[PDB]
Paper text:
Here cryo-electron microscopy analyses of human CE pre-B complex and B-like complexes reveal extensive structural similarities with their CI counterparts. The results indicate that the CE and CI spliceosome assembly pathways converge already at the pre-B stage. Add-back experiments using purified CE pre-B complexes, coupled with cryo-electron microscopy, elucidate the order of the extensive remodelling events that accompany the formation of B complexes and B-like complexes. The molecular triggers and roles of B-specific proteins in these rearrangements are also identified.
To that end, we first determined the three-dimensional (3D) structure of a human CE pre-B complex (previously denoted the 37S exon complex) assembled in HeLa nuclear extract on a MINX exon-containing RNA that was previously shown to undergo exon definition. To enhance the stability of the CE pre-B complex, we isolated complexes at low salt conditions, which led to the formation of predominantly pre-B dimers. For example, in both types of pre-B complexes, PRP8 has an open conformation and the BRR2 helicase domain is located close to the PRP8 reverse transcriptase-like (RT) domain (PRP8RT). Moreover, the BRR2 helicase domain has not yet translocated to the PRP8 endonuclease-like (En) domain (PRP8En) nor docked with its U4 snRNA substrate. Furthermore, U4/U6 stem III and the so-called U4 snRNA quasi-pseudoknot are present. We previously showed that the U1 snRNA is base-paired to the 5′ splice site (5′ss) of the MINX exon RNA in CE pre-B complexes. Owing to the poor resolution of the CE pre-B structure in this region, U1 could not be clearly localized, and the nature of the molecular bridge linking U2 at the branch site (BS) to U1 snRNP at the downstream 5′ss could not be discerned by cryo-EM. However, protein crosslinking coupled with mass spectrometry indicated that U1 and U1-related proteins communicate indirectly with U2 components, mainly through SR proteins that interact with the U2AF1 and U2AF2 proteins and SF3B1 that are located near the 3′ end of the intron. Taken together, the molecular architecture of the CE pre-B complex indicates that no major rearrangements in the pre-B complex are required for the tri-snRNP to subsequently interact across an intron with a U1 snRNP bound to an upstream 5′ss during the switch from a CE to CI complex.
Residue numbers in the entry:
A (entry chain J): 385 to 395, 412 to 427, 434 to 475, 536 to 605, 627 to 683
B (entry chain M): 6 to 128
C (entry chain N): 539 to 587, 590 to 937
D (entry chain F): 164 to 522
The structure:
Amino acid sequence: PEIEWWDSYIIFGITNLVEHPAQLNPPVTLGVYLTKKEQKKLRRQTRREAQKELQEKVRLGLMPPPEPKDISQGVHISVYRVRNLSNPAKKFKIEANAGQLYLTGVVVLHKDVNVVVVEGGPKAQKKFKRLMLHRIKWDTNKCVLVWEGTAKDRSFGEMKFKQCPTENMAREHFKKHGAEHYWDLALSESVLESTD
Amino acid sequence: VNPKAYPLADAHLTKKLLDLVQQSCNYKQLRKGANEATKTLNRGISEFIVMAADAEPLEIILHLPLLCEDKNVPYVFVRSKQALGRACGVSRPVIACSVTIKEGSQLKQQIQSIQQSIERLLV
Amino acid sequence: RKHTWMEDADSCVAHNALECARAIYAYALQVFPSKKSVWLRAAYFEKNHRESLEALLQRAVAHCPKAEVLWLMGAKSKWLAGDVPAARSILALAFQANPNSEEIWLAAVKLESENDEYERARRLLAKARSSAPTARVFMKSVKLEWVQDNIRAAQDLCEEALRHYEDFPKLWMMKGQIEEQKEMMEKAREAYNQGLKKCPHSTPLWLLLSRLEEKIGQLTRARAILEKSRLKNPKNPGLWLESVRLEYRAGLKNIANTLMAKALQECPNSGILWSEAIFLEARPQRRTKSVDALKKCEHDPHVLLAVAKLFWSQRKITKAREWFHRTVKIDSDLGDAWAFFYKFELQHGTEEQQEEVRKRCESAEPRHGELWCAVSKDIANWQKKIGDILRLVAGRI
Amino acid sequence: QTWYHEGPNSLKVARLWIANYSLPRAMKRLEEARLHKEIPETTRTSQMQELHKSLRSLNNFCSQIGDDRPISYCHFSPNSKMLATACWSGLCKLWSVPDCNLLHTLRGHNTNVGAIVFHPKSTVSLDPKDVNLASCAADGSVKLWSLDSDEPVADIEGHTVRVARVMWHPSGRFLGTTCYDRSWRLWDLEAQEEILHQEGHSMGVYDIAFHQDGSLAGTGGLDAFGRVWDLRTGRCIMFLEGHLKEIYGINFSPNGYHIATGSGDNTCKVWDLRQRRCVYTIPAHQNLVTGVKFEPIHGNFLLTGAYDNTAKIWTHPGWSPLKTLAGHEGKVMGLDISSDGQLIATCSYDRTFKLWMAE
């Protein structure tokens, strides 16, 4: 590069002009808790109202008296690394949990590097992490959580078990959905775990 | 609000904190009052400590985050003490509450989520 | 039927007497020859209840071949009661029955190093290293070379043990202890760092590295090494206790209390962490901290030793003696609890309580203690007795 | 709807001085980039491999506790002299690096101190009796402080909101400060007054950092929109977007294209300036990335902290996990590399500050 963009724009464009450009917004109900006495008073009032309604209905002659007797505004996106997706029930249970949890993503498999990326709500991501980390029993084959952050919107459409024997094809498939950085970080973490 | 009250939660954060405080007080896992919160933080059995920014004076709650720096507990300040008192199941306003951990309670995941969400507000 | 007879003999030995149990053990030994377990049980019953133990050891050596544990117990009973050169001849005869240098050569080297003529011990260690080399034999050879004097041959043997047994942190810890006893101290820190980076999970090597980085000044590097040891395990109770002790050694009492609270939140079922939190607490606040330590970590020797120290500090000798007796009954192998019981018997009580504490320390050998390992790992008190080590642990409190 | 407003002539004179000081600096940076581009790929690859091997064996040492308050920010002094820390208390100590000895702790604040960043030419060509460091608190205060006085100077009362961070200009005569009043102030050292208040975000700005040449200045806060405003007449055209969380850290690379922004969405945005796009979205950690620092004048790496107990030193470019500089016990708030590149301090919420040195 010969010069930068601001250096080419300035070189004379300096003046005493302060501006406020691009004022954009960044991408509510409160419950009430009632004490035991308040709950008892409400129950008494409701019972009195029901008794009054029954008395009015009986006195009206209508019936005889009873006989005496959100993916928006932030989506939690996790990415885990597994040594072998061979475990059918464990992988199936984790995938089933993610699918039952209205969570999208992908499950890419490779030589000793399996990247399972899920994206959904926080209560679904916590359940998927508890399923993949405590419920799904893998065993040398272990599953660890590589990353867990937040994104603006979901990237993938649905959980599709992709497969690529080489890292370049899986990286291109992740870059087609705009998630090649997480797969590259998972591959780098797998290489650092295998080297150390 | 008070500038000394830090950190300050948002609207949905205070709603989730009030729901967790009501679930803890209904399951007998919450202690209301500043002295009970100080006793729970001194004993090391308090999972979280919530304060009120609408306290006059707020300095009587000022030892509540500092004890949170002595026992490694998350601290948060509510918007009003009357809302914290109504969420604690009492007609009187509460200025300081302590949600304590229990032996395998069902609200441990919600308490862990509230501790994870309250640790990012103080920055 | 032999297992039921051994169980009945053990129940009779634990119940009322020892003559019928010894008769049942002799009947089970004379009915059919058994493995080393029944011979070890008979040797333990003879040692717990002089001549009968030597006769049982001779019968086990004559009727049960390939029993290194029974031969070692017979050699120990001959060295303690009978004679040391007779136990040396018994170990030499057991070396002609078992050609393996795993435990017989180390016992012969220990018997030759407990007495004089340490050149014979060095020759036996060299023969054990040339016949069947191992990490424990090399560590025993380095200890026998470093107990006399810190010679360069001991450093060369420690370097050869670190080059041949780099996976074992004991050789790196011995090399760091040999280099720390020299004039310089950077070589011991480098050897401790190599042992911490080569194990990679070595708790006593990291504790020695933190102690060397704290005692030689610049305790910030010691705190960094303690944090790396706590994060490298991860969340070890010993590394957290060492970091809490390093924080309490300085003027940062609030940081030490925060580290103790973090260690209790990361490991509540730890006796040493509960004892450190009870000792770091206040004097009117210790009655609740000891109750919380007893409720969280029940039937623990370190928590009982901390309760005994709190009862002795509160001018209650009748409660401190009962807590020391409960600590000795829960775990008699503890060194710190036995040292605290000996200090409580020497501070408050007659000579009968001190004699009973000395008999309890000489019956079961204390190990894995805080004050016991500080005097048992030094070269000046390596070949000493148990009573002198207990007196040195009680006098240094 | 970019509305324009006229300013004073002193702000225009300071903008003309900043342009006249940045244009030969940009010319020298372009000449250095053309000289580095003329170097062959073999020696550059060998230097990059040597830098990666030096950054991979980065051990943490000299973890000296500052005070009982957790450390919120750290700034390296020029020429590897010291390191100014800013904890949650009112004191701003200056520890002698790599000796880890505190000396001349600059106190004078009442609330929780924010980012105490020293001047880029403080230890180089400025007197120690004059103003050398600039600190900020949780209230509205931007106070100058010396290195051998242990007392603050005449602060700027033009900020009435929570001043999160403050960073001095590379020229030395200016200093930006990100306040919580949905604007960022630009105080002057020669004029001794606030020259401009650029409001480029709807929410309060958190981190403000100028470029390597001093022409541009990157902003960012709770409005989730990174603005790169020019020092001549404003007009931020390099708008950074994509992060759904609050931008808590901004750092300008010595190269004219790359710019690192740290957000709370567990990612870091290395965006380009010649294309006005995001070149890399690196998942550095899983916690909220608050601290972020660029490389020195060599320009090879980037050290990004987070709310976890670790800090990732990644390559620049490439966005690869080169070094995991863990060892802390709290949220890593504030980190700065030295001017020599061999030492880097990372303040954390465990009330301690260590330094990563090559083994």
